[PDB]
Paper text:
Recently, it was reported that a closely related enzyme called Prim–PolC, operonically associated with ligase C (LigC), is specifically involved in LigC-dependent repair of short DNA-gapped intermediates produced during excision-repair processing of lesions in mycobacteria, further expanding the repertoire of pathways in which these diverse replicases operate. A notable feature of Prim–PolC is its favourable activity on short DNA gaps of 1–3 nucleotides, which it preferentially fills in with ribonucleotides. Although the crystal structure of the apo Prim–PolC showed that it is remarkably similar to Prim–PolD, it contains a unique C-terminal extension called Loop 3, proposed to be potentially involved in gap recognition. To understand the molecular basis for its gap-binding and synthesis activities, we elucidated the crystal structures of pre- and post-catalytic intermediates of Prim–PolC bound to DNA substrates containing a two-nucleotide gap.
To elucidate the structural transitions that occur during Prim–PolC’s catalytic cycle, we next crystallised a post-catalytic 1-nt gap ternary complex by mixing Prim–PolC, 2-nt gap DNA, Mn2+ and a 3′-deoxy chain-terminating ribonucleotide, 3′-dUTP (3′-dUTP is UTP lacking a 3′-hydroxyl group). The structure revealed that the expected turnover reaction had occurred, as an incorporated ribonucleotide was now visible on the 3′ end of the primer strand, leaving a 1-nt gap. Further turnover was not possible due to the lack of a 3′-OH moiety on the newly extended primer strand. The crystals contained two complexes in the asymmetric unit and, fortuitously, each of these complexes represents a different post-catalytic intermediate state. In one complex, the active site is occupied with inorganic pyrophosphate (PPi), the remnants of the previous nucleotidyl transfer reaction. R179 effectively creates a gate that is observed in the ‘closed’ position, thus preventing PPi from leaving the active site. In the other complex in the asymmetric unit, we observed the next step in the enzymatic pathway, the binding of the next incoming rNTP into the active site, following PPi release. The R179 ‘gate’ is in the open position, presumably to allow PPi to leave the active site to facilitate the binding of the next incoming nucleotide. The DNA has undergone a frameshift translation in the upstream direction, resulting in a loss of engagement of the upstream duplex with Loops 2 and 3. This disengagement is promoted by the increased splaying angle of the bases (111.6°) at the hydrophobic wedge I73/Y74, a difference of ∼14.3° compared with the pre-turnover complex.
Author numbering: 4 to 331
The structure:
DNA sequence: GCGAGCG
DNA sequence: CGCTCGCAACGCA
DNA sequence: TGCG
């Protein structure tokens, strides 16, 4: 049929192909229209607050998740008037205009473009040199899974954050692991925030060394949860809160309370189930913006590691370097 | 999914 | 016109 | 010249 128009909180968004299948395993429950309806359910409320003012990359499947994948950082030169952008700087020093999430219409436009997963930077525009978010990525290695991740998050990481006077917010990744966010004052750069995250990861590890590893080299990790400290680098992003994932059942990265995480199963949260699960339930991340935390406690961990003779760790193998940057 | 470049 | 082609920043095997 |  011809295209239709969605009125998204006052902004008109062109919408096509509602019945195109994106998730074959789900049949009629895996159409592009189902995906747009899910995003309409979350983009005005809890998802928008967590994405607000952030530049994002888009992981697009215009022909569904078994077709071509388009990972897109730059915004197309020609695009609707209602989309806003902001300037990000990549590890090489190149800059680009990235889509900035300012209104539910930009999430719905992304969905119309086939975006399954949104990937926000850890900064807010326009101060895109200073993260306001430290990310902890609990990544089960072969032989481990979500049970290990939720156990380590609840029993090791959360009590450590309590001891440090820090508050963190957990979500399922929608894969096998767990993400934990700390809102921080935007007072430190990517290098400093990443060092803080390395010191946090090393402290989690030394509290549960049989369950946790920070080893960059895979042959040393074993059947343990890896804390991927490099996710705090520049141009390293995360699937956003409330993003659908490229899994056969369209799982969703789901914010939880710490109490819920203890017994959670990530397959419970999909683009088909999440809206009904939010109804009547307090947003567990309602307070994330209420306290702009200092990195101070984690930078103390950094200095203590330096006294142990432990400094920086390798960046990812593909990681660029800026002409003036320090040892990668 | 869509615009730019081609023939 | 219809049709194909980018859409990732990057170091490496 | 691809891999991911
Ligand atoms: O080259 C890349 C490739 C992925 N990136 C981002 O990082 C995450 C990678 O997530 P990952 O930990 O590898 O796996 P998950 O999707 O989080 O599921 P999991 O819990 O099973 O690990 C996805 C993107 O937002 C990135 O920033 N740069
Ligand atoms: Mg917007
Ligand atoms: Mn992960
Ligand atoms: Mn990871």
């Amino acid at each position: 049929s011809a295209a239709t128009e969605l009125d998204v909180d006052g902004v008109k968004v062109r919408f096509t192909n509602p019945d195109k299948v994106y998730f074959p395993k789900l049949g009629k429950n895996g159409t592009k229209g189902k995906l747009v309806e899910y995003y309409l359910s979350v983009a005005s409320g809890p998802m928008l607050a967590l994405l607000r003012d952030r530049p994002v990359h888009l992981q697009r499947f215009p022909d569904g998740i078994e077709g071509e994948e388009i990972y897109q950082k730059r915004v197309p030169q020609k695009h609707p008037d209602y989309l806003e952008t902001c300037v990000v700087t990549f590890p090489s020093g190149r800059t680009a205009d990235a889509l900035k999430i300012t209104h539910p219409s930009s999430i719905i436009w992304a969905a119309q473009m086939g975006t399954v997963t949104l990937h926000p930077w850890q900064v807010r525009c326009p101060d895109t040199e200073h993260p306001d978010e430290l990310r902890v990525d609990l990544d089960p290695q072969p032989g481990t899974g979500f049970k290990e991740a939720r156990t380590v998050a609840c029993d090791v990481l959360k009590p450590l954050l309590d001891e440090l006077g820090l508050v963190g917010y957990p979500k399922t990744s929608g894969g096998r692991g767990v993400h934990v966010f700390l809102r921080i004052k935007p007072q430190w750069d990517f290098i400093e925030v990443r060092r803080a995250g390395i010191a946090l990861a090393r402290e989690v590890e030394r509290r549960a060394p049989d369950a946790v590893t920070t080893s960059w080299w895979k042959e040393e990790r074993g059947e343990r949860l890896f804390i991927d400290y490099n996710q705090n680098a520049r141009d390293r992003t995360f699937a956003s809160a409330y993003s659908v994932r490229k899994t056969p059942i369209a799982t969703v990265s789901m914010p939880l309370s710490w109490d819920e995480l203890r017994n959670a199963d990530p397959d419970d949260y999909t683009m088909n189930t999440v809206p009904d699960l939010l109804a009547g339930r307090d947003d567990p991340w309602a307070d994330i913006d209420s306290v702009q935390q200092s990195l101070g406690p984690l930078l103390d961990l950094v200095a203590a590691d330096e006294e142990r003779g432990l400094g920086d760790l390798p960046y990812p193998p593909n990681y660029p370097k800026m002409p003036g940057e320090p040892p990668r």
